[PDB]
Amino acid sequence: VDFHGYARSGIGWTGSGGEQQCFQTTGAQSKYRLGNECETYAELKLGQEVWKEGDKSFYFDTNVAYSVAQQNDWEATDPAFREANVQGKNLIEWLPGSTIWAGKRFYQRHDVHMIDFYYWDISGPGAGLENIDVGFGKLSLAATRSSEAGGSSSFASNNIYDYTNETANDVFDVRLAQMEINPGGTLELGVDYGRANLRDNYRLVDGASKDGWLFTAEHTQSVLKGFNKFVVQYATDSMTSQGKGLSQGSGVAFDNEKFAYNINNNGHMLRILDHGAISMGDNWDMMYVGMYQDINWDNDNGTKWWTVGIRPMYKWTPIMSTVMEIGYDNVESQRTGDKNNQYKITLAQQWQAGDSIWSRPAIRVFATYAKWDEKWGYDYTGNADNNANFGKAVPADFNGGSFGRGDSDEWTFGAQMEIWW
Amino acid sequence: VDFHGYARSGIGWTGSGGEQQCFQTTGAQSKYRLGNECETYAELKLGQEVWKEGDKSFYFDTNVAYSVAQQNDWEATDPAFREANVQGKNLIEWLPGSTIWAGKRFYQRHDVHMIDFYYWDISGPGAGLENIDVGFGKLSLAATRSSEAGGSSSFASNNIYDYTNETANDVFDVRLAQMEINPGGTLELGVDYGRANLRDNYRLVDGASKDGWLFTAEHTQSVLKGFNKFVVQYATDSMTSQGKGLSQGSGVAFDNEKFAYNINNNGHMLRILDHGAISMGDNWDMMYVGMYQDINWDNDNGTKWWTVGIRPMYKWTPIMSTVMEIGYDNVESQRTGDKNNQYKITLAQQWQAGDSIWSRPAIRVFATYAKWDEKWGYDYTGNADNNANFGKAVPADFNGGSFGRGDSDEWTFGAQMEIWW
Amino acid sequence: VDFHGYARSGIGWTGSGGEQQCFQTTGAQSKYRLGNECETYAELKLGQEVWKEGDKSFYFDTNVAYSVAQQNDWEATDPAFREANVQGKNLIEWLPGSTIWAGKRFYQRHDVHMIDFYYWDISGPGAGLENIDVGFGKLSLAATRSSEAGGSSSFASNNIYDYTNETANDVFDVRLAQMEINPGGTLELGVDYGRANLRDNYRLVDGASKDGWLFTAEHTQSVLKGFNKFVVQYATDSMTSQGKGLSQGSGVAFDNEKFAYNINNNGHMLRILDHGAISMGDNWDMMYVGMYQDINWDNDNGTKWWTVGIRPMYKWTPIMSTVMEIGYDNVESQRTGDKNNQYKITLAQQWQAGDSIWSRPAIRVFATYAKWDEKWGYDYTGNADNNANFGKAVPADFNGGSFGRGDSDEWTFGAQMEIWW
Ligand SMILES: OC[C@H]1O[C@H](O[C@H]2[C@H](O)[C@@H](O)[C@H](O)O[C@@H]2CO)[C@H](O)[C@@H](O)[C@@H]1O
Ligand SMILES: OC[C@H]1O[C@H](O[C@H]2[C@H](O)[C@@H](O)[C@H](O)O[C@@H]2CO)[C@H](O)[C@@H](O)[C@@H]1O
Ligand SMILES: OC[C@H]1O[C@H](O[C@H]2[C@H](O)[C@@H](O)[C@H](O)O[C@@H]2CO)[C@H](O)[C@@H](O)[C@@H]1O
Ligand SMILES: OC[C@H]1O[C@H](O[C@H]2[C@H](O)[C@@H](O)[C@H](O)O[C@@H]2CO)[C@H](O)[C@@H](O)[C@@H]1O
Ligand SMILES: OC[C@H]1O[C@H](O[C@H]2[C@H](O)[C@@H](O)[C@H](O)O[C@@H]2CO)[C@H](O)[C@@H](O)[C@@H]1O
Ligand SMILES: OC[C@H]1O[C@H](O[C@H]2[C@H](O)[C@@H](O)[C@H](O)O[C@@H]2CO)[C@H](O)[C@@H](O)[C@@H]1O
Ligand SMILES: [Mg+2]
């Protein structure tokens, strides 16, 4: 049996008091992780090559995930069964080297490690024909699925509270990779077409986006004994809310009191990213990110996000280093034009199983400092019924109350382990 | 560590719209599975032979099951801890080859694969002395347990709503197998005696069945490089509701509003089954079922069910085939004499790790078509309190409303993987 | 992958009727286990040495626990993710042989097997520097965490119902072990300092204990081919309620109707224990316990507990024995001076993978008999709001009602397996 997975777990303290707190900018879709993770998260994978005959094999893979608060020993939880799929390679003679798979699977996900941000992730139940040799590159075809909690009406209503039926969304993905646009550089190109798939006779709210597109172009350049990826993505309508390849075409959300509300996503998103990891000399490693994300919605409630951070690692020994992370976020409300921003600085002393900034397990002892100034927040007071500004960007002091995190500081510290195996 | 289990997972679509739907006849205790399974189900077993000295060993086995809807990637769930037992073989000198076991265990279950129907399954917490050589055959002894959600009263009441205490049921099983009644044929004989086991001073509703019997006779005949099993079972009272070897002697059920209601099972059941799998030549494999099940209750709410289906497999290659399944159901209401019936036809193109119809993993790409006509359904409208016909068979149009699935059609299609390892 | 764990599972019956019942004295913090365990409990550990270079290694360990009632086969549950940690040995040159760990971990827990009582257990999320060679012994340093369900107020209130915020408690542990005070005898010394760690601006109820100490001294003496441990512990205030090394400094509890109530623990605890396991000859093994525990609270609601039991094992064969357990409990109410007492006697026939009383797997077939006489119980009638004596020791017949288990008997019997691997 092959045993694989991912896990992080630790203990932490907040400078001003209590358990460790973590810091993410309001409106930002991520935070800089080092010394800024507040849960024990673990994926336990048990797979196995179950049959092989020459070139041909069938591989079976599973994945059970756990997320607990790490405030006690006995912490009961609901594990998520995330993967259960079978991959058959070289089963099709006419398309050599290609794999046919079916089942629940984490499919070719692209992410930026230091911000734990996935930018191209259509995982879920699915099926596909993978790595077909097109000569100049490899072509992959996949269909995966997701579903919104409500959004469909059994009959025609004008009342949004009637659209409570779960709505399936399908994604049809096509990728063409490993094309050497240049020396030390490859180009991947993807097209995602997602759409809400209604049961016979159901209906979506009038004006719901229904479908959309995600277009991706990723260029990888081998550099400084590392790499640099430069990404450009553009989404349309139903693909703009999740923004990673999954569709949300009903445009309906629910308050905690089960009230439906209209979160319509007609609009577009433009993401331009550049991240990588480079070694410089023998004593230095560094990962870096720079991103600009603009979600422009018809309804005016989008955001324009900018991030940058770097994570230099200095190796004292082949197994001991000092890692440092500095991250900066700035998010502007499409609705109000206000701006939330933050900068985090973490300093850690670590021990890792390797000499790379990618080496795991790592055991860290850190101190983090964050200072923010948020001038807007989302209005989640009231009910989708009470509140009519429910879920909308609103200034920090709107109507005497207060939104966003304010303008303060905080420092935390602790020890943590992270590992993938 | 030995890693074993079962898992199926896929993606599907309904002809008329939305996620894949599955089709089972109202009153039928099963459906024909091919291209008719709508969940990701998986059992992950980790066991190990923990001690061995010569002929003697102790084996430890566990089983954790997961069932998710397969509509999203992150699907939190409550796994079922189904097995945790220790089997000690050859530990008793005077009864060589026999095993003593204790713990939660899937014990010698008999099922019909294509309809995923278990007809002899007394699994659960238990203990036993297994495979004792009686000379002409092997004798097995086991005691297992189950419990109904309510059914017991702490005191005497005339009000069914008072019988809300969980009621333990015990099964005492004796089997005598591997007797060669003939050439290429064996005979197994079993006797199950189940009974509700009340706490000191509790009582069951007046007239509750309390106990019952299940008698099984299974004949296996080696044929056409395969087998054919012919089964005949007869149950009495408390064993008729579950109908697989477990007892439900309280005769009390609960509506979703926590209302107790009387589901009394005094009566009997007669099951006559014949299934098998035969290879015919080199290019053909086929499994088949034919069953007649009559649950005749004193309360008149039983059913008389008839099924038949076949699943021919034609091998193009040793790893690629075309499988087809055709199934037919017909259930008649004991209470109303009406009839529900259905026929399903599925066509699949598969790739399996082997040349058998029993070879797994299998990766299928299918299309299913079902056409039904249901003339009765169960009344689950109202409350066990509001409704007094609650849970009873009622005609399709009863009192202007509508019961059963109607008279329609539907086709689905998709890809799926199934595997046992 | 290393597969390890613990599991017990069985089937049982109560003499007077129904599923097996188990017997523990009111006020006692444990029961004598043999033939007195009523659940299927299992810990499945999957770990692995992930990197090794010479003397240095990184080990990764996990632990997922399950507890089900064992009354049915399908029993859905919420597993507890109890361990996910990484241990790095010999990573620090100046402190050879020492381990640095971080993550959730069962840390050096001390327990008495026959009563399944842990007396020194600070496990949970944590981090530490383990086994530092101090020359005359090994020094260990650890910081772990726990948190109470409520206990903190966002603002100052005089109303206990306002203290509903979860309150983190930190433990700082220092141990010095393996000192040979004598021949065949070692001495371990520990100091635990626990404290409630409030968020900036939160407050604890007026008079809440806040912090406390646990002092441990354990002497192990190699004897009769076995050992004998003699323990003496003394706790103060916040460490007296849990009494194993974890802190509960808020002093606030909640009724099932979510009502806060004051369970203040200022006071002290004195525990004096002696347990061991000795072999006597070739045909006899025996474990034994004797303990006196005095929890003296300022609020007068403590207890003075005395236990003693022995578990002789007589080996007929190297794999078959007859085990017997006799246990006695006596608990006196600090508040009322009344006394609850019980004696249990179990007789079992077992088969184990080994000739020791510590050999597992063990498959038992037993009969247990318990006879008790309880003259007090805790008042949990009403609400923390209705009842003002809620949670207090009260005589058996207090105000006409009845508290405690009474004065009766009962016998049970069944089969069970227990195993650690
Ligand atoms: O497995 C390789 C990747 O491991 C991590 O990815 C984790 C991520 O950190 C965690 O927060 C997420 O929930 O699960 C994935 C594992 O599936 C790193 O973050 C990635 O950079 C690595 O490539
Ligand atoms: O998918 C990778 C991410 O997995 C986790 O995130 C979970 C989260 O823990 C869960 O509560 C939420 O409902 O779903 C997400 C996955 O969609 C990890 O926490 C992250 O580190 C990973 O990025
Ligand atoms: O493990 C051998 C059997 O595998 C399957 O049995 C599954 C069944 O398909 C699934 O629906 C049920 O819930 O669990 C069992 C595994 O315990 C096949 O259906 C059987 O025909 C095989 O003999
Ligand atoms: O026991 C074999 C069957 O196991 C599963 O069925 C579960 C079902 O998933 C669960 O929701 C229900 O409560 O219990 C049954 C088992 O009693 C599989 O779904 C089936 O394929 C198997 O036949
Ligand atoms: O693993 C060695 C110890 O196994 C058991 O400890 C169990 C205990 O029995 C169980 O009730 C508890 O919940 O979990 C632990 C396993 O972590 C024995 O009780 C101990 O005496 C053994 O040393
Ligand atoms: O920690 C060892 C003990 O683990 C279990 O006890 C659990 C119990 O099952 C769970 O319901 C409760 O909430 O937490 C405790 C652990 O704190 C075993 O049941 C025991 O045998 C062990 O002593
Ligand atoms: Mg749950």
mmCIF file with all atom_site columns, C-alpha atoms and ligand atoms in Angstrom, chain A residues 76-79, chain B residues 77-78, chain C residues 77-79, ligand 7:
data_model
loop_
_atom_site.group_PDB
_atom_site.id
_atom_site.type_symbol
_atom_site.label_atom_id
_atom_site.label_alt_id
_atom_site.label_comp_id
_atom_site.label_asym_id
_atom_site.label_entity_id
_atom_site.label_seq_id
_atom_site.pdbx_PDB_ins_code
_atom_site.Cartn_x
_atom_site.Cartn_y
_atom_site.Cartn_z
_atom_site.occupancy
_atom_site.B_iso_or_equiv
_atom_site.pdbx_formal_charge
_atom_site.auth_seq_id
_atom_site.auth_comp_id
_atom_site.auth_asym_id
_atom_site.auth_atom_id
_atom_site.pdbx_PDB_model_num
ATOM   1  C  CA . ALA A 1 76 ? -14.125 14.731 17.049 1.00 0.00 ? 76 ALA A CA 1
ATOM   2  C  CA . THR A 1 77 ? -14.651 15.864 13.478 1.00 0.00 ? 77 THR A CA 1
ATOM   3  C  CA . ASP A 1 78 ? -16.204 15.036 10.146 1.00 0.00 ? 78 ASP A CA 1
ATOM   4  C  CA . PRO A 1 79 ? -13.517 13.853 7.776  1.00 0.00 ? 79 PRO A CA 1
ATOM   5  C  CA . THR B 1 77 ? -19.279 12.764 6.300  1.00 0.00 ? 77 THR B CA 1
ATOM   6  C  CA . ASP B 1 78 ? -19.663 10.381 9.192  1.00 0.00 ? 78 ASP B CA 1
ATOM   7  C  CA . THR C 1 77 ? -19.529 8.227  14.168 1.00 0.00 ? 77 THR C CA 1
ATOM   8  C  CA . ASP C 1 78 ? -17.236 11.200 14.481 1.00 0.00 ? 78 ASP C CA 1
ATOM   9  C  CA . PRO C 1 79 ? -13.660 10.007 14.633 1.00 0.00 ? 79 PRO C CA 1
HETATM 10 MG MG . MG  D 2 .  ? -20.538 14.726 12.834 1.00 0.00 ? 7  MG  D MG 1
#
